[PDB]
Design a protein around this ligand. Structure first.
Ligand code: CMP
Ligand code: CMP
Length: 275
């Protein structure tokens, strides 16, 4: 076991930084404690290359604070495929598939990261993903909207999703809120409402259906709220995973978007500007 001593201020900041990391959701309190003890802090300077495309993987990072740009060099040209804003994680691909870094991550401000060495990672996270794969691989392959992906790409979706459970009445997401997750209902029922004024029910999602994609596609705040009816289980994915893996089905989703407009105009007379 690898262990790094941390001040009290570090443990509080570390625990708060890890609370929403999807790759840690399917871990028991004991595996999680080992991960926490293995975490070490790392300061980064603005302009610093935390990760360079092509290198061997070494650590997995959870963001404590700071901004970062994501670059993928495609044919001598560097594209900015996204960014991180004071929250999130990265560097898990090289450690899961033993491949070279697939992108360059640069800090665009001073910041801090929580690192986790590859050994502790593969020993716990990777071991845990195998378990996750046995529970959901079948379910994910069967989703109609994911048929657009190559079969190998679909299997990779399982590696980065995390399970989230909600009790009856819990708010899953709120209208007007910023968005960082894409959801897939695993079990239970999710009620979608929108405020004209009072809240109006506009849709319900059952096993196999998704929601929370509109904000990620149009880059806007959540257009509606979502609450759980009874006990709900959702498979969540962060926006970076969404953009890396679901590009192939940005059509089927774009096609479902148009429907959102018609429905709202029909119910309210205005499209509420969701596009
Ligand atoms: N579109 C993307 N392609 C590849 N890596 C990405 C992308 N968006 C974010 N990343 C992250 O950037 C990291 C770069 O190193 P890794 O390949 O280990 O893991 C990668 C992911 O965690
Ligand atoms: N008519 C609709 N307009 C907007 N969002 C809708 C509608 N029907 C269902 N939704 C879903 O509710 C989600 C609310 O958050 P998002 O905007 O991220 O994504 C939205 C869609 O997935």
């Amino acid at each position: 076991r690898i262990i790094h001593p941390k001040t009290d201020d570090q443990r509080n900041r570390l625990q708060e930084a890890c609370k929403d990391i999807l790759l840690f959701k399917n871990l028991d309190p004991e595996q999680m404690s080992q991960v926490l003890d293995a975490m070490f802090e790392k300061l980064v300077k603005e302009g610093e290359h935390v990760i360079d495309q092509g290198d061997d993987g070494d650590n997995f990072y959870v963001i404590d604070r700071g901004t970062f740009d994501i670059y993928v060099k495609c044919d001598g040209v560097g594209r900015c495929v996204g960014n991180y804003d004071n929250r999130g994680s990265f560097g898990e691909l090289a450690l899961m598939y033993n491949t070279p870094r697939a992108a360059t991550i640069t800090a665009t401000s001073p910041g801090a990261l929580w690192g986790l060495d590859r050994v502790t990672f593969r020993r716990i996270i990777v071991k845990n993903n195998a378990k996750k794969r046995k529970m959901y691989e079948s379910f994910i392959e069967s989703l109609p909207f994911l048929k657009s992906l190559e079969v190998s790409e679909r299997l990779k979706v399982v590696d980065v999703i995390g399970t989230k459970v909600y009790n009856d009445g819990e708010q899953i997401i709120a209208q007007g809120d910023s968005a960082d997750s894409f959801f897939i209902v695993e079990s239970g029922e999710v009620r979608i409402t929108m405020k004209r004024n009072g809240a109006v029910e506009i849709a319900r999602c059952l096993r196999g259906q998704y929601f929370g994609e509109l904000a990620l596609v149009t880059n806007k705040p959540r257009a509606a709220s979502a609450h759980a009816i009874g006990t709900v289980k959702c498979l969540a994915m962060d926006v970076q995973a969404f953009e890396r893996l679901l590009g192939p089905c940005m059509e089927i989703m774009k096609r479902n978007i148009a429907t959102y407009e018609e429905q709202l105009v029909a119910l309210f007379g205005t499209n509420m500007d969701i596009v």
